[PDB]
Amino acid sequence: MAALTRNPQFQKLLEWHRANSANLKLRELFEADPERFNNFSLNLNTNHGHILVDYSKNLVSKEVMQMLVELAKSRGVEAARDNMFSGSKINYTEDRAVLHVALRNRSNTPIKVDGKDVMPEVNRVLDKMKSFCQRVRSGDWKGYTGKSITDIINIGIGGSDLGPLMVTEALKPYSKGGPRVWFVSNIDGTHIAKTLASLSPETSLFIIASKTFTTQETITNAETAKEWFLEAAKDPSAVAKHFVALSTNTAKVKEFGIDPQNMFEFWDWVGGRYSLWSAIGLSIALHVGFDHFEQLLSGAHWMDQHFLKTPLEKNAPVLLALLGIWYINCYGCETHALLPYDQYMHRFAAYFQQGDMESNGKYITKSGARVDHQTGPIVWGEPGTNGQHAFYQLIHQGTKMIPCDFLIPVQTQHPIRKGLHHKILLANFLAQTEALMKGKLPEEARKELQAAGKSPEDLEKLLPHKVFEGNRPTNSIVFTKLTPFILGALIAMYEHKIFVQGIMWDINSFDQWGVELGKQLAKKIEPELEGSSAVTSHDSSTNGLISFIKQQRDTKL
């Protein structure tokens, strides 16, 4: 077996679930205990707003929470946490520290890797970013014809894209005075082509985000942008006015035509999917200003400290992690839905798809043994209220158990019509989790059918269709306002949830060996596509698809 399944607190939890989970009914839990919301929620005061983490609509009793906390302890969560924060090389397959918490370490307390405090270099790069932001935002940085920059284009993939994109979308109201921001990530030529079509070479600045500066898709996109730019500028020396790098590869950066003074460094202890807090966040700082970027870091820092200092039983990311374990490893739920009731947060779920699924979509434990239990869930979702009219039908009346996190700011950035829209949004947010829990009893549905004038025959036929079984668990995460600080705290909360789950599963949340095979095979196929000759070097499906491609690419439609 594996570490988790060999653990006796886990065996006890599993045994308790088998014997008792059928007895757990949300309706009954709330009816028996009017202190339930009080005892199963955390109202966090950050001094820059409150975050209420309401986990009371979960299929848990006091005893279940006690068992889960005991399990987190006996799986080494407290020790693993301290190891991360101290700079121990907890990314064990790559022998690397994991120090995204250093990037936002506002206290400046020394954090050592290999005996050397990392904070001077973190703060050096931050200072460089702040200086660059001043130059671009003020209009002092001029393009090749002497004009101020109006547009910033981040070119990057995965971690170099999703973070900056989600945060700039989420924090759009804080971007007054800032340049427009664009994100190019897909190798699909459509992405760069449609971005470039709406831009001027004179006033656009490109941020090429790649640690190694050899990332195929990113560098291809970058070179395409350079080609486009040089067609207009006709001067290789002008590239340095319009292209900067988030990288450590001085030589490749120089070769591209970028001034190495405009290379913004980060370190191997910064994972791609934990990188928005580093130089990778340069586009965020340009868009909303460095002051707001620091507020984002400070919120994350607040949450880092909460995670570090708080006893497990009242520790927000730990509790969220434990609930997930309960549903994944005891109930066997394959997915987790993230449902922010906020249009600005429309890319939040997509971001945590990488954050969660690339971290914890793993099957080998620290010992090298295969897991014999589930690990990370499939993460998905869309913002409310749109989801209600898309897929909540399945959540309410399907055959799947789907843990959902509902998120919403109390205060809206756009209180139009005296707050009418936000009142409706809030009411739907509250109503949906209430409905998921309560359902609708046959006696309730029967009376509704009778009042609608349904015949006894039609009533009988329709009745079961109108019943909602309920007992569907949710978390409600409510916060004062979606500010840079509060957004930073929320992202950090989920990063730490992911960390806790990985430790409990005995997996490495911080590597990504599963990307290798697809990369290797793609490199083999690339040269085979060119020309008319038949490709026979793969399985018949791959061969057959390539044949179709070669046959269909010259057809005029």
Next chain:
Amino acid sequence: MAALTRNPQFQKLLEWHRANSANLKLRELFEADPERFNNFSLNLNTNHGHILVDYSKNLVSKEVMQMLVELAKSRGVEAARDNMFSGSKINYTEDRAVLHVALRNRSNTPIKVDGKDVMPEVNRVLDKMKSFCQRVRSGDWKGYTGKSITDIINIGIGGSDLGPLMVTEALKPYSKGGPRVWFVSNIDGTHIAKTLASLSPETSLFIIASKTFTTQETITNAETAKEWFLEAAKDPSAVAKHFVALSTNTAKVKEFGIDPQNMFEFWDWVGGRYSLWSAIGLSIALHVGFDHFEQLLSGAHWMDQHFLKTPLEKNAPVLLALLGIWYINCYGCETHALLPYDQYMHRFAAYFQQGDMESNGKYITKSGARVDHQTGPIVWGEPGTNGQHAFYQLIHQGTKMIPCDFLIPVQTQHPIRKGLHHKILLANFLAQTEALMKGKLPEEARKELQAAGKSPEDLEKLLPHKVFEGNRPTNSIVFTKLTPFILGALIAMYEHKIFVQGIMWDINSFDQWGVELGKQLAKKIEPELEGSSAVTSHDSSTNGLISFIKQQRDTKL
């Protein structure tokens, strides 16, 4: 028990699965049988391009496919289909026909509901759409100050939003010469606020899309739009130049105050999530032109005829549906990922979240029996290569089985850099499904680490992390080009897949009773948010969240 589980062919399939499925190994299936691609793929010639549905990388043999086809026949798929197409009232809980196929019935063969041909009215509304599109696109239609329309704003949610949004995004290259299109859907005030901030009341035309014309989100948004408009125009007669309606509810439309000549009608047998083919597609037609809209309809019509006339064993939507059943009901896979390798198709998976999940997220059968088996899956995904660099780690090395459909056009709309970007995109599309199928054996990974110069200790430490178990099934769907015609055929293909699965589960794919309870509960909460008084009328969580909202809404941040 339910119809499916009582079915003898289903119990036979399940028993075969129990006894034999562990012996299905894709790598070995392909080595043993050079004809595998040929026997497990459909190359469809539409005369307007080809669609290759390659299902060879599935965990199936000839025997499995034979049993699945036999099950489909046993479940009455052909009769159910014919009933749909002839206008039988197969939406049995609402006593309605289901005739999205009539909307695109290019042949104009009569289809009767209650003994009356529906086609004259379908075609009457199509002619009205054609005329309106010509007037707006030509610049002949003038706003209240006498200026041509530059922007179209679709206000609608769910079925009234996702279809037109996904199609206009997918068909963006075909929109040259058309007005800019905007979609407002969320009740969240952000959505309409940031849309209106970018518009002029003089040159904006709003399209209020609502089957019922009573949906709170849509009518609220519409009323906000009208107030904004009237603040500028100061003339109620001007509304008729700037607002049109897409609805089935004439009375409610006139009640809102729209010119009855500005109402584009559809019918109760048009489901919201099947409605882009109706008047609901007006924003599509305005954006890309009525000719391209007709091509979209014609593509769907082609696929309707394929579905209607083709033997089950060669019938694309039926085969896709059957593979789905195999994974859902035999393997127990909760999800289905849709992965189009096309940035224009970035909303394709979202569309089918509604389409699939709202249709088949059901638990009561035609007989009134509660299902005792799984129904519709959770549908999710992102376009390649975006999704690739986000979450494929979990698909390759997680603990979940995830059937994936990979989709790509052979011909790109933007063949930049002499096709370099599309070559890379295609190679990744191909490599990923090859990788998922083949994996990488311990001995293969050992040889790679051997060659990298890893020491015995370093090799042994890393080895298990580098192993890919493979045997992960995929569909590859490749088509000549994403034209309006081909897109129409692809959407209809999945609509019919959803239909077939529903018939097989004995559920009603065409109702959505699961939305009612959330709506009722939201109406109750709305007025309780007003004022500073404590709410005690709900469970303690709802009460507590409301207390939080009231406490937090006045805090300055």
